[PDB]
């Protein structure tokens, strides 16, 4: 509690010292960690909470000064009011698992980062008929599967998950996260959220505005462990203005509970594999899919991988290939024959009864046999450390963390994402990727990517691996970054998503009508946080305390 | 013009004059018609909406009363209009089209308010796009307009609408209250992506990804903002980045909403309409749990209704045509009104759409499920006469607009409605618990029960048609004592209200008071911060901006 | 008077009426013109500019327009003026003559502003003198007007003056702006000291050593301050003492200049024009190396300049009187011209000054230097054909005002100019790749290339002017796309733009935003300072005070 690497702007020692022991005294030292020493990056397993674990920036870039963790809501409510008094600014985190886009790491550097997650973690609520459950930030896609199989649970309710099983639900869900059944669009699915604003005042969105009637046994309950009424989590929208989406992406309030829906079990599944033999085959593939997506025979959320990502899942570059330089166009046709896949590789997923998933199966099947070379496997037809055999499993809500090994493609791992929006247009998915392809080979990477396929929409997840220790590699990726952002926005896509190096150049191309949005949002953030205690600068959103000149990147 | 009926609070009729000339002269006379008669508060009917007051007038019929209706011709008119009305500090209430009778019509809530009829002269389809799967529509653009736009285009073949009971509603209008259509698409707000406002500072703001511009090139050149194209992906993916703003402008007063990109419904490749006739009153109970399970499987693919027999048989006569009965019709009766036009006492209307193997097996399972229920009868549009409402919702689930179910209004003379819109979980007990609740004090009040449950995916909309003669002043407050209880009833019991007339606006969100109204109070300071002036619809959804009186204005 | 066509931002037509009225009592109705009609939005000439909108619109015609026309007579109506649009919150547009055709004419940066034409009472040539080798001229003083006061006083023998292309333009208008003459003096801006503002406040301020008072003596007594004579050393020496603010008002919204003191170079004793042809297109790299240390080491005096064939043969000749072709005319075609013409694909244009040893050693040096290139022909006014551009830039470089240059504008039908005018590094190289990029552009929008690289000491003025058909909706939005395409395409490789047109100065100060845009908001921060109600020309050069919308202005 006395001495840290880096404070926050304009705050004295003094201060920092006087507001730390206040916290120290407020939820136990075992709750604080200030950061004194001269910030290890951690693994997956136990995640670092003070900086960026897959630096792109230099590693110390992005540090916070301390790590707290309350032991329930109140302690926010009163670490908050605090900050209020001292101006300190705050970064919230579920569990910190958000590698790519810079993990735990405050954007303004001398920040608290606020580990909601450890603590607060309890599965609050699942419910059957409902088909839904209420969480905490520390409930991990793992852990509320592990909640399932200890109640005998998945012959009524699947769940929805990410590549890796890590991550927080209520975290991924605000930051508009994606999953690969017919719930994958987690943001959407959610219903009723609990908040603490940066006036310390607790807020329930939707139908959980609506209190659940006064009675007996909940009688005298503080607010934050007062039950919901009974459509809370049912019926998303409420009475008047449907304000959930100012805190998704945003820095408007912490959030300390939320309704998800979950998927009830289709009473039948079958994953399958896909494989498009040449390079050239994915504009056929986007323009087959399109209608098929649109008609909901493809049901979940399907995702057209390149062959170096099923690839480096497998093994690493090494394992492979010798050289420094990226891979030809010659030497990936080899893997896709040492594999028995294709230069693209298509996943997806059937579900409900066997009448239908026969039904929809034969189309995909004729609808795909357009393409030359086409091949079709179910997890059975395909080798026992096959891709497809772990995807089976995240297309149907069971965790698996084997897509974490395609970080080790090159030595020292990291991640950084690249995630623009295109079309589901064989003719825009493929100036997208060449756009893509182009930068990364002039930046002397591997080109590694999907195109994951929403109704109308395909998030293209570009998927940079860099070596850490590597100092020339990170200069040129981040150029590489800067230089794909700015040319993406000259063809009309822009980025769902991203890493805290990179939000204020992506927020400035959406400045249509002179930066009439940013405005907009800068007004109702000064409007809810008058201090510009949460999260300052998250989605390039600065309150009216941080002046653009100082602050942008 | 110069001596309106009523005026705008704390606002001299020397400055509304000066305000109405400045704005004569931006719109032009044929735009503002100023109420200064009682000859101009007539109710007038669906085909001809009265823009001035409510037409179905639960309280006094000039109590919620315009100064002056103005029809800007375009987006820079409304920069212009905001910006004055800013200046004289002048309330306005911006309406699509104005047929949200049963919610208040095209009043505003504060009395002398200018209401801003933005489909005038903005009702333009912006766009249709087939790839997409998508249109884009100015607030004047009703479902019959979208509709006859997709037949003079030979698109039908290709997408479909998704209509609410009846077509002659504001496609943006519906969509930012929230409105309930009957295919898949039936939420329609939820199939809503990139939105245009004008703020009440003035400046032009679009949503998602429309505020990713477009890029520059030569034909679009010069532009006026709100004339500039999208983005590609404006309309096919909401959110952007950073905070998602879209819902602060649903069923609120923060902006004016020009244009919206709604999805449309491609053309399924098959589709077979339904209906489930469900004998007793209480096999609403075991129906329910019937249609809880195959909803959450999508068994139920669009958005299916019971209906209560009289809703249906309402349809079809008004009350006089089978009692001649002053109070309302006994159990025993509605059973006899069931046999004469071989019904349910409650009715299950539903569609199947895609591809015949995949119909086939979804009504295996629906009739297999349903058919647990004792005297349960399916047909299919064919199967019915001519007059039916199968033929009807055959129609309203694929889109079609029709006007059809407007005679239900009729039930009584002088016929209003008044919708009191309560939520339910998809549970038989529940729906039981608050149907028991809604009928009680229906017969309290000397009222029919009419009323339809709208199943979405994990709740189902209540809707309770209150249908009442207008010129009775006696039952005007027995309607409204009924409204105010039920709020209070089903609040009592954790039932919300969607959505309501403006008379009830200020009690309902009265009951969303959890940690003591904390949901209003800051909506009330995001209201402050971006209407200073409190210019845009005070008083909306029981939110006040601060130049307001809460012990004034509030109801 | 009553109706104007547009009005300013947040004012009411009642406000404008009494705006006005007051103004007509203080300047008189022969001094006011309101613009009341589409009658008056008429494009003129350049004998007769239009003071009301854009004459050479690559907007709408009626984009920038103002509200009316006000003409004081005198700087006390000036104070009075200012005092009152404070009052009304009125914004001003102040012009000295306007003639900025090219870069907007006349007309506002926000629609409604009064033009305050400076030079229709305040046109007096208030001092010359010899001794000190300056004059001292308010706004009205055309180039024609002071070099005709010359005449008329047999100076020219002892002073010369510094003209740009064309003698029609205001000397204190054109400096203020940093226009570009062609003798030594040609840098305008430069050869200034002390000067005269109104501030936004009345306040009357005098720049330079115009701040030391002229010592009081009987003669001088009682006189209003703009009629008081000025010190001894106010136009001998401009820094005086403490912060040199002279550039607080040229290109900029910060005062309303009354008078301007301007130096005047000496007759030389001795002077010679020439022109150098260049045969090939590719000649300009060369060139621009062999131009560089002459102009360095001041072989070359004067401001040189390198015009291209098309420029010189516009002179001469519409595009209708040389093909006949409505696309661009190839490089195989501009070379036939240039030999019809006598003259290279590029033209170099300068003057020799002094007694005639010198002037001698001078021409055998730079005739020496540019032998380097294939084909260089050397020609003195003497040796061309009477019509020649020559003889005119023999007049133009000793300071005679012409108006030949003209014609160039009508190398289209309805032709109008803009002016794109980024800077270059005096190095073969850049020229030509400055030179590349911009030909390029006018290709992919179906212009004919047309400029000149005017040489100041270290830095090239490249000079692209775009000749439009004005009729032509199609062209315009062409023009536009060319324009910011260019912006954008010169920035991207490090060449800013000088001087712009009222639709780019928003765009080209955005590519000024070295740190997150710190020069405008500094820029922003002093402008709010000393116009607190932000009534003078706000947008000038991109710079708003805080009542502007940047959102909604913004271009
Ligand atoms: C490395 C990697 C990452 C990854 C992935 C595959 C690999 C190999 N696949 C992903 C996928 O398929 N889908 C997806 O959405 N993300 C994927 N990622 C990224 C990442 O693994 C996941 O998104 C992960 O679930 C996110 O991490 P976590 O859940 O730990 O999130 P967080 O750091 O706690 O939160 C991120 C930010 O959101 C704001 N935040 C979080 N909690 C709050 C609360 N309670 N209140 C207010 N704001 C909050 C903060 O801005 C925080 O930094
Ligand atoms: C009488 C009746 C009504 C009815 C119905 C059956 C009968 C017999 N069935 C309905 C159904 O199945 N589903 C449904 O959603 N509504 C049904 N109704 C009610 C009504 O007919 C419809 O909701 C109708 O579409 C709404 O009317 P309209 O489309 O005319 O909308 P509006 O009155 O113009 O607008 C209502 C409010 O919306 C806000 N608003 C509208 N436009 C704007 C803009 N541009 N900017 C800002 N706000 C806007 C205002 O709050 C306005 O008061
Ligand atoms: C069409 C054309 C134009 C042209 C040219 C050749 C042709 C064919 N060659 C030029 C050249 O060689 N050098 C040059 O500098 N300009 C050339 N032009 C452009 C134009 O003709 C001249 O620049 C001309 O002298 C400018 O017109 P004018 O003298 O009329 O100036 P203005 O329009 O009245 O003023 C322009 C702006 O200046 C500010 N201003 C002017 N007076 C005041 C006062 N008193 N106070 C404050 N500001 C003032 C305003 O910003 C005004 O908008």
Same mark, same amino acid.
């Given at each position: ?34 950061? =004194? ?22 590693? /110390? ?5 301390? *790590? ?6 109140? /302690? ?32 303004? =550097? ?7 997650? !450890? ?34 649970? +998945? ?7 990410? #590549? ?50 006064? +009675? ?8 934050? #462990?007062? @039950?919901?009424? !009974? ?26 509970? *939320? ?28 323009? *087959?899919?399109? @209608? ?12 057209? &991988?390149?062959? $170096? ?6 093994? #690493?570059? &090494? ?15 080899? *893997? ?21 998933? &026969?039904? $929809? ?17 179910? @997890? ?42 295109? !079309?589901?247009?064989?003719? /825009? ?9 182009? +930068? ?15 109704? &109308? ?46 939000? /204020? ?24 946080? @008058? ?23």
């Amino acid at each position: 509690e006395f001495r840290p690497l880096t404070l926050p702007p304009k705050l004295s020692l003094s201060d920092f010292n006087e507001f730390i022991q206040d916290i120290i005294r407020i939820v136990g030292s075992e709750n604080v960690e200030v950061i =004194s020493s001269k910030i290890v990056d951690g693994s997956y397993m136990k995640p670092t909470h003070t900086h960026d674990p897959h630096h792109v920036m230099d590693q /110390d870039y992005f540090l916070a000064s301390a *790590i707290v963790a309350p032991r329930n809501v109140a /302690d926010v409510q009163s670490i908050v009011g605090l900050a209020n008094k001292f101006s300190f600014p705050l970064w919230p985190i579920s569990i910190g698992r958000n590698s790519g886009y810079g993990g735990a790491a405050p954007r303004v =550097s001398g920040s608290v980062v606020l580990d909601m997650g !450890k603590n607060m973690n309890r599965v609050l609520e699942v419910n059957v008929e409902g088909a839904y459950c209420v969480v905490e930030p520390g409930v991990t896609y793992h852990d509320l599967h592990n909640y399932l199989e200890a109640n005998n649970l +998945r012959d009524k309710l699947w769940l929805d998950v990410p #590549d890796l099983g890590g991550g927080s639900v209520l975290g991924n869900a605000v930051e508009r996260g994606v999953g690969y059944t017919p719930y994958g669009d987690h943001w959407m699915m959610h219903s009723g959220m609990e908040v603490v604003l940066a006036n310390g005042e607790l807020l329930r969105t939707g139908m959980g505005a609506l209190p659940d009637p006064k +009675r007996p046994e909940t009688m005298g309950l503080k607010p934050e #462990d007062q @039950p919901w009424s !009974k459509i809370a989590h049912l019926f998303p929208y409420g009475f008047g203005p449907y304000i959930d989406g100012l805190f998704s992406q945003s820095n408007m309030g912490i959030v300390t509970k *939320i309704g998800i829906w979950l998927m009830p079990n289709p009473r039948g599944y079958q994953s399958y594999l896909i494989t498009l033999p040449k390079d050239g085959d994915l504009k056929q593939a986007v323009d *087959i899919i399109r @209608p098929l997506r649109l008609g909901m025979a493809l049901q979940n959320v399907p995702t057209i &991988r390149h062959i $170096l990502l099923d690839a480096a899942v497998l093994g #690493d570059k &090494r394992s492979y290939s010798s050289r420094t330089e990226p891979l030809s166009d010659e030497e990936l046709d080899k *893997i896709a024959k040492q594999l028995n896949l294709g230069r693209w590789n298509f996943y997806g997923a059937l579900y409900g009864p066997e009448p239908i998933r &026969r039904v $929809l199966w034969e189309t995909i099947k004729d609808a795909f046999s357009a393409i030359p070379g086409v091949k079709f496997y179910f @997890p059975e037809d395909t080798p026992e450390n096959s891709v497809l055999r772990v995807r089976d499993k995240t297309m149907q809500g069971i965790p698996t963390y084997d897509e974490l090994k395609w970080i080790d493609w090159l030595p020292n791992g990291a991640h950084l994402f690249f995630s623009p929006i295109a !079309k589901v247009s064989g003719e /825009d998915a493929m100036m997208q990727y060449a756009v893509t392809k182009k +930068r990364c080979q002039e930046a002397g990477l591997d080109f590694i990517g999907t195109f994951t396929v929403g109704m &109308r929409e395909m998030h293209h997840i570009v998927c940079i691996v860099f070596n850490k220790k590597d100092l020339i590699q990170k200069r040129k990726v981040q150029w590489l970054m800067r230089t794909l952002i700015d040319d993406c926005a000259a063809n009309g896509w822009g980025e769902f998503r991203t890493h805290l190096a990179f939000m /204020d150049q992506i927020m400035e191309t959406y400045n249509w009508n002179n930066s009439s949005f940013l405005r907009f949002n800068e007004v109702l953030k000064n409007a809810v946080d @008058p201090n510009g205690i949460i999260a300052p600068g998250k989605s390039g959103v600065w309150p009216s305390q941080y002046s653009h000149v100082t602050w942008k990147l």
